[PDB]
RNA sequence: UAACCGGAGAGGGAACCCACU
C-alpha cells in the first residue's frame, strides 16, 4: 500500500487517511510504543547520598 | 432500555382518571384537583384564570416530578363559593375567551388576505 | 409453546402496527421483542396477529 | 430447496454454498464472502 | 371574575410565516398558545417504514429516521384522518394513514440523489413539500446500490416526536422596553433595541411602570411547510379549546359522582 | 470450527432439540440452516448467533449474544483462516439515542 | 455524514440546501452571503450548513460493484 | 475455465491486476515482457481512470471544484 | 351405543494492557 494513489487505496477498501505505522498480527493492529532509556556512550556524574559513595561516574 | 414510550405523556392508561378532586383538610374550603397526563400548558392557564376570580383566595399548581405526567391544582375560596365551581368557571370563560380569540384571528386573516 | 418464536404484529392499543418476534407466551399475554426499539414489551395475546415470514415456489 | 447463497467479496457474484464446501467464489477465486440480507419482515419506526 | 377580550392584529402574512399581535390577554394564556404551536398541533408524518432492499451506504434506521423528518403537506386531510391507535381497523387504512413508496436503483454511472421526489404517495394531497427550491436529500446511491421501501404516514403531534412539529420557530415576545422590569439590565445601554421598541434612540429602557401587567404579546409563527402558517394558529386555538372542553367534561363527571 | 480430536469436531449447524444434547432455552430458528444468523435480523440478549455443535450425541457449543445487548445483525462474513477452517465474523449494530445518564464533554 | 434534514434547534428544513449552497459558493458568493441568499437567518440554522462535513461523498468511493 | 473467456478488468479486479501486472513486469529481466506489461498497465490505468471520473462525473466533481476554490 | 401424547439449569479456570470515578 505504498506510494499508492488515492483511488487505489479506496479500491482495496482502505482509507487514504489511515496513517500507517502499525502491524497486523493475527488480524489485530498493533502499535509499538516508543520506549525511552538513557543515552549510551556518555559520562554522567550523579551523587547518590543513600550509600557509601560521594559521587558516581556512570557510563 | 428503561426509556418510557413517548405516548405515555398524553395517553391515559386503563384505570387512570383524568381528574380527581380531594377535599383538603387543613383549611376550610380548599380542594386539590389532580389532573393526569397534563403539564404546564393546561395548568398555567387555569391558575392564571382563577386568580382573576375575586372570590378565590388561593390558586396554584405544581408538577410534582417532571418525569411523571400529573399536575396538582390547589384552590381555596371564600365560604360562599366552593372550589368545584371556581375551577369550573375558570374553564368556562377560558373557553369563551379562546373561542373569541379564534373568531377574531379568523376575520383578521381574511381581511389581511386581499384587504 | 404455540406462537413462541413467530413474528407477530401488534394490532390494537398504543403499539399499533409494530412488528416483533414473540419470546415468551402464556395463555393470556406474550412478550414481544420489538423490532425497532430495543425493548421487550408484554402485550395481551389478543392484540396480536401473526404475520409470518415464508417463501413460496421452492424450486 | 434453498442452497444458502453467498455474495463474493471482490466479485459481487452470488454463489451457492452447501455444507462441506470450500468457501471460494465460483469465479476469480476469493476466500472472503458475505451473506445476503434476510427475507423476514423489516419494519422500522421512522423515529 | 371573568374572561378577557383579546384582539388580534396580523401585521405580516406570507406563506411561510405570520406576525400577529395579541392584546388584552394574560401572560399565561399567551404563553400557553405558544406551547400549543409547538407540541399539540396535528400534522402528517411518515411513521412506519418497511424496508425491502437497502444497499445504500446508510443504515436501515438512518433511512427511516431521515424519512420521518420529511414534511408532508397536511392541510385538510389532517383534520379528517384519525389517530392510528383509534382506527377500528387492522393494518393501516386509507382513513387513518397515507401510504408512500420509494423505489430507486442507480443504474447509470453518476451518483443518484434519492430526493423526496421519489416518494410517491397514494393520496394526491398529502405529498412531501414539492408542489411549488430543491428537495430533501435522502441518500446518494452509487452504481448498483438501491433502496425499495414502503412507508406510511399517520397523524400525530409534536409532543410524541418532534417530527410532528409544524413550526420552524415561534418568536414570542412581550413588553419590548423594560417597562415592567421583568428583566433587569446591569447596564441598560449595551442592549440593542427590540424590533418592536416604541422608544427613541435616546433612552435605554422605558421608565418603570409600577402597576402594569403584560399585554401586547408579539408572535411570529414560522411554518416548516407542512401546514400554512395561519392554519397552525387556527389549529392551536382549537386544539387548546378542545383540551379544555375535555377537561371540563371529565370534571363534571367527577363532581356529580362525588 | 475446528478438529478438536479424533472423536471431537465442531461444525456450523442448527442444533435441534433432538440430537444436540446440551442446548439452550433459546430460539434457534432465528438462524438459518447454515447455522449462521442472516443480516437484517433483530437479536437480543442471549439469542443464538452462530449455531455450532461439537460431536461427543452432539453437544451444543453455539455462541450467543452478550446479555442485554440488543442489536440488528449488520453483516455476516464467512471465510477460512490460516488453518483452512471455516471462520465467520458477525457484526451487530445498535442505535443509541442520547438518553439520560450519557456522558457529554 | 449527510446533511441533516432539519436544524436540530429550530426545526427548519435544511436538507434541501446543501446542493444549493455548494453551488452558490462555487459561483462566487461569500460564505455568509450564500447563507442568507438561501434564507437562513437564525444562527441556529446557519451552523447546520457551515459546520456540515459531507462524508457520504467519501463513503461512496468504496463501490460494492463497479 | 471461467477466467479464460472472461476479461480480467471486469470489474473489481482492476487494482489487484494493476499491482500484479507491476509484479509481472518487475519479475522479468527480459525487456519484451517489461514493455508489454508497461503498455498493458498504462492502458488499464487509463481505462480505470476514465471509469472513475465518469462515476465521479456528477456531484463529487461539483464538491471538488468548491473545495479547490474555498482554500 | 365411543374419545391418542408428558423430557428440562444449564456453564470454564489462568495471566496481561487500556480505560472510568
Ligand atoms: Zn474463489
Ligand atoms: Zn385504519
Ligand atoms: Zn434552526
UniProtKB/Swiss-Prot annotation, chain C:
CTR repeats lie at residues 52-57. Ubiquitously expressed. Methylated by PRMT1/HRMT1L2 and PRMT5/SKB1. Methylation negatively regulates interaction with P-TEFb and RNA polymerase II. The modification N6-acetyllysine is found at residue 16. Residues 2-35 form the KOW domain. Signal peptide: none annotated. It is found in: Nucleus. It comes from the Eukaryota. Component of the DRB sensitivity-inducing factor complex (DSIF complex), which regulates mRNA processing and transcription elongation by RNA polymerase II. DSIF positively regulates mRNA capping by stimulating the mRNA guanylyltransferase activity of RNGTT/CAP1A. DSIF also acts cooperatively with the negative elongation factor complex (NELF complex) to enhance transcriptional pausing at sites proximal to the promoter. Transcriptional pausing may facilitate the assembly of an elongation competent RNA polymerase II complex. Interacts with SUPT4H1 to form DSIF. DSIF interacts with the positive transcription elongation factor b complex (P-TEFb complex), which is composed of CDK9 and cyclin-T (CCNT1 or CCNT2). DSIF interacts with RNA polymerase II (Pol II); forms DNA and RNA clamps that stabilize Pol II elongation complex while maintaining the nontemplate DNA strand in the transcription bubble and nascent RNA in the exit channel. This interaction is reduced by phosphorylation of the C-terminal domain (CTD) of POLR2A by P-TEFb. Belongs to the SPT5 family. This is Transcription elongation factor SPT5.
Swiss-Prot record, chain H:
It is found in: Nucleus, Nucleoplasm. Residues 29-63 form a coiled coil. Signal peptide: none annotated. Component of the PAF1 complex (PAF1C) which has multiple functions during transcription by RNA polymerase II and is implicated in regulation of development and maintenance of embryonic stem cell pluripotency. PAF1C associates with RNA polymerase II through interaction with POLR2A CTD non-phosphorylated and 'Ser-2'- and 'Ser-5'-phosphorylated forms and is involved in transcriptional elongation, acting both independently and synergistically with TCEA1 and in cooperation with the DSIF complex and HTATSF1. PAF1C is required for transcription of Hox and Wnt target genes. The Plus3 domain mediates single-stranded DNA-binding. Component of the PAF1 complex, which consists of CDC73, PAF1, LEO1, CTR9, RTF1 and SKIC8; the association of RTF1 appears to be less stable than that of other subunits. At least in HeLa cells a N-terminal shorter form of RTF1 is also found in the complex. The PAF1 complex interacts with PHF5A. This is RNA polymerase-associated protein RTF1 homolog. The lineage of its organism: Eukaryota, Metazoa, Chordata, Craniata, Vertebrata. The gene is RTF1. The chain holds residues 498 to 568 of 710 of the full protein.
